[PDB]
Amino acid sequence: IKEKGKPLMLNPRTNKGMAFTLQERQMLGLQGLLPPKIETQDIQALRFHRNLKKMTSPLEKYIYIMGIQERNEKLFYRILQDDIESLMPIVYTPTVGLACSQYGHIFRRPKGLFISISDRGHVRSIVDNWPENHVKAVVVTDGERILGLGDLGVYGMGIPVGKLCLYTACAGIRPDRCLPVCIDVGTDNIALLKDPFYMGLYQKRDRTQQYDDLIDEFMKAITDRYGRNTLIQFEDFGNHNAFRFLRKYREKYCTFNDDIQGTAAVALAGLLAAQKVISKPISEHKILFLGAGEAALGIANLIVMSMVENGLSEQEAQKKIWMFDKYGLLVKGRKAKIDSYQEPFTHSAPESIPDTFEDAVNILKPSTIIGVAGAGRLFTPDVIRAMASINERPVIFALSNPTAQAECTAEEAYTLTEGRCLFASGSPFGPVKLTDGRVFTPGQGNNVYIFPGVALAVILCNTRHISDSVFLEAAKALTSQLTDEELAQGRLYPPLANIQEVSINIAIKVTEYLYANKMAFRYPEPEDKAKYVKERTWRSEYDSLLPDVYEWP
Amino acid sequence: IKEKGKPLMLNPRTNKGMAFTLQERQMLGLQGLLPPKIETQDIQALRFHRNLKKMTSPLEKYIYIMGIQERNEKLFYRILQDDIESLMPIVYTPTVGLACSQYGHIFRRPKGLFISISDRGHVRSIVDNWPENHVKAVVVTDGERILGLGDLGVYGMGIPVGKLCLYTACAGIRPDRCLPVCIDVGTDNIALLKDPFYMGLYQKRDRTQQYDDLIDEFMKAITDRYGRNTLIQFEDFGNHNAFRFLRKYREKYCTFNDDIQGTAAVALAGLLAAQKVISKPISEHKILFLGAGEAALGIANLIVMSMVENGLSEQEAQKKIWMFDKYGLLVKGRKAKIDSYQEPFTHSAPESIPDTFEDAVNILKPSTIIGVAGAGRLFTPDVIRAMASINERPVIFALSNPTAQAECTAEEAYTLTEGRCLFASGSPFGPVKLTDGRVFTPGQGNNVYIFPGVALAVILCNTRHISDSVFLEAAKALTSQLTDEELAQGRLYPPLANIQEVSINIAIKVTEYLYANKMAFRYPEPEDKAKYVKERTWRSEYDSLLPDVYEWP
Amino acid sequence: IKEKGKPLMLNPRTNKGMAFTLQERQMLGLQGLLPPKIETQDIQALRFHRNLKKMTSPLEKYIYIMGIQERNEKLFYRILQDDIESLMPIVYTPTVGLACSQYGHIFRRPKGLFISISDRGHVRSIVDNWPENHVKAVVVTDGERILGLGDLGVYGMGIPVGKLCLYTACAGIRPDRCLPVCIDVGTDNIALLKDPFYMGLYQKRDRTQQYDDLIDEFMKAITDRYGRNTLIQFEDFGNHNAFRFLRKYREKYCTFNDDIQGTAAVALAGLLAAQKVISKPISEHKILFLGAGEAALGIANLIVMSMVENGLSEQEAQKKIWMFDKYGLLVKGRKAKIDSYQEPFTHSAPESIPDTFEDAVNILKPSTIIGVAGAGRLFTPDVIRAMASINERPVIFALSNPTAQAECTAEEAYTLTEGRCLFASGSPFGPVKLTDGRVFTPGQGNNVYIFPGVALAVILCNTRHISDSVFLEAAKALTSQLTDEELAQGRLYPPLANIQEVSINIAIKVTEYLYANKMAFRYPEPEDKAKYVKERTWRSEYDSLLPDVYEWP
Ligand SMILES: NC(=O)c1ccc[n+]([C@@H]2O[C@H](COP(=O)([O-])OP(=O)(O)OC[C@H]3O[C@@H](n4cnc5c(N)ncnc54)[C@H](O)[C@@H]3O)[C@@H](O)[C@H]2O)c1
Ligand SMILES: NC(=O)c1ccc[n+]([C@@H]2O[C@H](COP(=O)([O-])OP(=O)(O)OC[C@H]3O[C@@H](n4cnc5c(N)ncnc54)[C@H](O)[C@@H]3O)[C@@H](O)[C@H]2O)c1
């Protein structure tokens, strides 16, 4: 640190509150600016939980917790670390969704970089205004597809902020090396355009070439100042833009799309886990998707790669996958458009064409149902009953977020399948107890289990580009940690309580994969990857800010 | 300002949030660090009120409001200015009392300078650590007598912080020129010495000569760095220390004790307002104090000065004042101690010595009772009834704070006297409506009506020492603003909603008084004292932070 | 010191070079940035004198020593203190005159505040850009009458810098509280307008009301930021502006013109010393001035006050003074103009009207001749012989600066008068040894013997305005320290080598004078004036920059 005095307390990155030791205060010019009391981070943590316990609504807890990030960064992450499972629902889904819809109402301090279309031609000067010098990871959004909430414009900034908190809380990626970014080119959200507290430009979305030029200028500026291997994570972009930007930049920059590729890995990881209680031939595994967008296509493509890696051919593996969107089942020659990415999963219409999703379930009789429509409770009771009849152990994945947009609840799933279903959801659901007396603990199929570990490995390996095979490897690494005892509880994923350890293990598997496949450029190559990764994870414990004082001979 | 970039946002003194104009953002390196939206202070204020409306408890609101002072100082005062009467109960008494009691539990950021006994011999170094260079006003406490709550030690820092906020919100004194100070020599509060969140030294109070040495070191260090005419306001010190320090320093430094002198002026101002409704001869005015400490003695002495000023000699005036403390009536020779300050109001034991305050009222038959004991509801229904039977319009001042320590409530006063009493309290009470339909609106006899205006005048006039006569003048300045109509509602003081205008008027009259008596050293002497003061009051509206850019011939 | 690291070395105010101790380097983040060697100031001083020894020209030395002021301020002043008499000719007259004439050619770094006519209306923002927050002394010039060199415009800035270096070297006034200022409204120096290295605006002098408006804005801005009692010393302004600005502001601000008033004091001090060897009746004291401008009038008015103080009436004392300017003797009705200040010394023509200064001497037969025309050797050998012929001990003062502009040299004065004259010069001349062996040590009648001491006293006493009597007192304080033995050598002033002590003694005397005459506002009044002044003189020895580190009981 080059600073001393009050500035050390005003910057959340360095502020320790009363945790500044006596020696640090005297040598750094803080003596007298702090109460005489010297505290430990442990005392500070207690203070937090004490106040949190008395709080009522989730949003109030969000405002309080996120506020700590702007006062004492170290304490912020220590607090999340004390109990990531109980706080995850507040800083992440579903509460982050509530925060975003009210971002302009709860605003106190801005977080991250804002680049608007009105700054076209001047994006580099904006990137140069960011205080931190060695950024290694960026999460960017334009707020067009915020969770299953739609277009929130600049209010969507809460997502990149939230995603990056997990980069640190889960994988130990250095906070000061993370940059949340919101690209504002307007919003089509009519309500927001009339909101006096809106934080973005009051115009509709610019969809012309300027939008593309802006994104291009952004990628250029970011890498020009921080380096070409700067990890850039695209998050919550509209459907059209998500795929196009991913294809356009994946070979030029170190980038990936979380909604497409991150979701694919976790969803696949769940199927690999379910495979342990079903065992049945993947040949007789019929997958039916509710929705055919970013997440569906991403999941389908990764599943295919898994089947193809296990014998089947890409052609036959795809036939085992069907999709049903807002217009119906995706079949060749249908009236609704079928894009380039969907084609491979669009088959010749069966004898009869299903009118509803329930019908598709009976006609196609799938063994697995994956919901990613962000349209609500479409995995209705009948749909679930049908699945229970058609299968002995049906796989039900209601992945849409936030909670209100989920296809169905864990409660509905288990009770309706008499406890025979294999369930996973995008948002958190507590254990379920049937009138029967059986207890089922649902897993959370959320990419939060993937992007932190993958991001860490990529950053540590100085990786230049991210292939989809990296996600295939991540999916395997996630599931390889699942213990039998946990499958028994109904868990298709490692306990969220161990997400920190699980993420580090993912990073270790990915770093070994990257090196083994000549995709890492960090030299020398470490002999022991496990030791290499663990030694470089950021800790929430306070560091000494004391200058190096020592006697000369 | 010599700072640009993020630091402008991190320092609450300069941070405007989204109110930073586009031009300021581009020229000061803030572009991109704030959302695209440019807001006005009006919008920010609306954001605040909207959120405030939804909060439940007073403590939660205190935490919210005081938190803004640490984020956007300008907005902080804007908020107070929008509705000072509704927030006064939150940032001042009684909620400020609750905040101090839990100061260590709600801690987020420190405010003020902390000087502890362990810093003996190094006080100048601590003072040199305060970031502001032109401090003009200091409010210091050792937290031994916080409101009527007793020894709160370092948790008492809430008072200096609260008083200084009022220096600005009421009198327009510049915030960056105010310095809250807490002297920590330990605490005798057993509960705090076992509180893991306590903010001070874990030791009983040091009452040896080291205490006095530390205070001496403090006075010298503050004046050494900021100037001998730096206003030093003592607040909430213990009884013994309050007087001896006032007597020891008032002729060497620009200092006064708010509890002794400020209270004196507000109470007197109330009695002076009561004469406008009583008219009764001073020869029939007999005052009886519940309590005989800092507030009681200060008030008694100022009342005497007023009487002497209007004819009576000191002796005869002092004869009209009686005191009853925790040991009973102060009569010569009583077993309980009688200090030098009390002696003038300690008379020969009456025919029968009253055992209770009720007996004292019946035996002495005062026309005015003033409560400054900070011990609770001592003005019992019987006490109030006696005053109603003895006097047609009994004067009843229950000035102890916070509300729980008040001698009685407004309801009890007006109801038990059938609307015949002239009431005033230290802490706020709403209007009282009697069964007969009459409505009485009580005034708040709290020194907040005086120290702001008095401080502004002393600072503006470069006054070197403050005499008691100054407080006599402030008292008269305060009451002269009361309007007959308001007096008719039961108001013995101008509406709290006009405290800002009232404080300025007091500042103007005190300024004219300071110059008329050759106590002001600011030269040249302003011709229009009114315009002089009004031109120098700090405003909450945002200032341009733009550099002075102009073209040359 | 709110800064640590490299900045401590880049700022000459704090830079110690290798004198930074090992602990300061470690604690302040300098370890490694300096050579491993720890030096004392003594070693640094030695390094300087060694290098200075090898240098040949005075300007080369000026560039060298003045460069040190921009690298290590403490060392700069230590160096001047090591031998002020040998370096005075380098940093002051006559070399400072050579440096101003080539200021744009030797430029490396700017020194001081520059205010031009192009900034009219924006002077306050310029004053606000000055880095130091507590300025107590300002020396300002418009460069119109630089020494006897005339209009040098912005190249004249070398003067304020010079005078201020002496404030510190002579009186121990704090460097960080001194502010050199140059007002640039153009220049009439044709040679500078065609100089590609000129440092000012390329335009003739603006003599319209805009000039006066700028000076007014400057006075207001300086006092608005630093205080109304901020000492403002006018230096080297043109003859018209000098008197009118002194008269215009002397009762509004704490200001004085060094050329008019400072010279008067030192000139009178030399005459008071001369009377220590002459003693003749003041009735037979006839004074003839070569020149009738700023210095002449100033000296004459002070000579009159001294006489009026010893008996003579104002009118009777003014009759003992004659002046001879560029147009000739000042007599009633002469063709050449005579201003208000000259009238009192413009007498009725004598028997005949002198054509040259030599004729004026033979016709008027004055006992004292004072040169202040800055026009060169006007005190010809014939003028000098005539004075020795008319008087047994002629008093000859050639005060014009620099040397080339002096009226005559010491050699010429003593040799042509056979060692019978009492000589003094504005610029330095070594001792003169006559062929008979008699040695004469000429004193330096230069206001550097006065402004340092007077400024220290005025600053220390918080004096608001400066009366001429102050300089009369300073004149006495100076000569009072002259010893007999030193008078024998031919010194009309104390040795230049003791200028530090002489200046302090003058400050002490002037301080007592200001308190005695109710002109000092610093309270309380020091009992011991000598101790008061001596305790507040800035020292050149290094101060510890270590933060206060100590153990808590
Ligand atoms: N091109 C480069 O490799 C480059 C450029 C500039 C500066 N550096 C600096 O040189 C030092 C050593 O280089 P190295 O390649 O041996 O580093 P390394 O082996 O320690 O790590 C490799 C990469 O991972 C990053 N990293 C490590 N821990 C991280 C964490 N916890 N959170 C986020 N990012 C993390 C580093 O910044 C580095 O770029 C690094 O500390 C780095 O800051 C490297
Ligand atoms: N759990 C996770 O890890 C995770 C990760 C990313 C996204 N998601 C969730 O997936 C959902 C969609 O994300 P996306 O990026 O794929 O969106 P998208 O806009 O790219 O695609 C949405 C798809 O759902 C279909 N759809 C909409 N309404 C429908 C309806 N009423 N009935 C049937 N189908 C309908 C659309 O036709 C479209 O094919 C969101 O709610 C999001 O929160 C979850």
Ligand SMILES: NC(=O)c1ccc[n+]([C@@H]2O[C@H](COP(=O)([O-])OP(=O)(O)OC[C@H]3O[C@@H](n4cnc5c(N)ncnc54)[C@H](O)[C@@H]3O)[C@@H](O)[C@H]2O)c1
């Ligand atoms: N950047 C700086 O260092 C800076 C800037 C502006 C003013 N000042 C100081 O202010 C003084 C001149 O001020 P002025 O001419 O405007 O008024 P003034 O001199 O008439 O005011 C008299 C005193 O009241 C103080 N003052 C005025 N308004 C105040 C307020 N609202 N709150 C608290 N204190 C207040 C001033 O500091 C001053 O000491 C100067 O002596 C200077 O030291 C310093």
Ligand SMILES: NC(=O)c1ccc[n+]([C@@H]2O[C@H](COP(=O)([O-])OP(=O)(O)OC[C@H]3O[C@@H](n4cnc5c(N)ncnc54)[C@H](O)[C@@H]3O)[C@@H](O)[C@H]2O)c1
């Ligand atoms: N960083 C700062 O701006 C700073 C730091 C320390 C003290 N101060 C000032 O000093 C005053 C306290 O009085 P004090 O004990 O310094 O002395 P003092 O009050 O006895 O001296 C009277 C005046 O002379 C000035 N002064 C003293 N020595 C000086 C010197 N050597 N050169 C130039 N000016 C000198 C002082 O500033 C003061 O205005 C306060 O009014 C305070 O504002 C300012």
Ligand SMILES: NC(=O)c1ccc[n+]([C@@H]2O[C@H](COP(=O)([O-])OP(=O)(O)OC[C@H]3O[C@@H](n4cnc5c(N)ncnc54)[C@H](O)[C@@H]3O)[C@@H](O)[C@H]2O)c1
């Ligand atoms: N309204 C205002 O503007 C204002 C200003 C300052 C102080 N106060 C209040 O005045 C109260 C006392 O403050 P202080 O500084 O004078 O305190 P103090 O400790 O100096 O004096 C307290 C006095 O009350 C007496 N007392 C205590 N219990 C008593 C009892 N049970 N019966 C009778 N007398 C009793 C004590 O003997 C003592 O004489 C506090 O509650 C304080 O909040 C009000």
Ligand SMILES: NC(=O)c1ccc[n+]([C@@H]2O[C@H](COP(=O)([O-])OP(=O)(O)OC[C@H]3O[C@@H](n4cnc5c(N)ncnc54)[C@H](O)[C@@H]3O)[C@@H](O)[C@H]2O)c1
């Ligand atoms: N030694 C000191 O302490 C000291 C202090 C201040 C000024 N000075 C010197 O005094 C000199 C004049 O300064 P000033 O401010 O009085 O100037 P000024 O311009 O106000 O007056 C100069 C006067 O000399 C007259 N003069 C010019 N040439 C003449 C000539 N050839 N013959 C006769 N008279 C002539 C002019 O008519 C004018 O009246 C400068 O050289 C300056 O260096 C010395």
Ligand SMILES: O=C(O)/C=C/C(=O)O
């Ligand atoms: O306990 C602390 O020091 C900080 C708390 C917060 O920022 O909320």
Ligand SMILES: O=C(O)/C=C/C(=O)O
């Ligand atoms: O409205 C704002 O910009 C700030 C709000 C806060 O600090 O609470």
Ligand SMILES: [Mn+2]
């Ligand atoms: Mn997403």
Ligand SMILES: [Mn+2]
């Ligand atoms: Mn109080």
Ligand SMILES: [Mn+2]
């Ligand atoms: Mn000069």
